[PDB]
Design a protein around this ligand. Structure first.
Ligand SMILES: Cc1cn([C@H]2C[C@H](OP(=O)(O)O)[C@@H](COP(=O)(O)O)O2)c(=O)[nH]c1=O
Ligand SMILES: [Ca+2]
Length: 129
């Protein structure tokens, strides 16, 4: 896989963000995770966590996996990086997302994110408390 440049347009919630990619606005949905919706427990915290991560970043990148790059809602499906740190992994490590939506061919970082979930769980963090 390889990282490509993108620019923040707007935070949306824990696992979606609006980014300018190859000069076009698109909503990106974070691969391999699921944050609570804003109306659910930890949802506001998930939203706040991702917002700080992307808004503070001097550099956002997106990394597509090997399979589909758009979901059925027209959202980009990627791993999203903020100054080199993967949002997807960071959410999971903080117990603010579960590993989820693991589809064949788009699962390159599955074991990485699983390892993070295991540690969040060990630490009884947030969703796991
Ligand atoms: C993360 C992801 C979600 N989706 C689809 C599955 C779910 O369809 P359904 O909407 O029909 O339940 C939806 C969940 O995304 P959200 O968790 O943002 O709601 O997005 C994909 O198709 N591929 C993906 O990689
Ligand atoms: Ca969600």
């Amino acid at each position: 896989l390889h990282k490509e440049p993108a620019t923040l347009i707007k935070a949306i919630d824990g696992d979606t963000v609006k980014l300018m990619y190859k000069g076009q606005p698109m909503t990106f949905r974070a691969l391999l995770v699921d944050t609570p919706e804003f109306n659910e427990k930890y949802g506001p915290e998930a939203s706040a966590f991702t917002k700080k991560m992307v808004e503070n970043a001097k550099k956002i990148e997106v990394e597509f996996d090997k399979g589909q790059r758009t979901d059925k809602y027209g959202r980009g499906l990627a791993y999203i990086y903020a100054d080199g740190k993967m949002v997807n992994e960071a959410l999971v490590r903080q117990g603010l997302a579960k590993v989820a939506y693991v589809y064949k061919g788009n699962n390159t970082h599955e074991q990485l994110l699983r390892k993070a979930e295991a540690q969040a769980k060990k630490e009884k963090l947030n969703i796991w408390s």
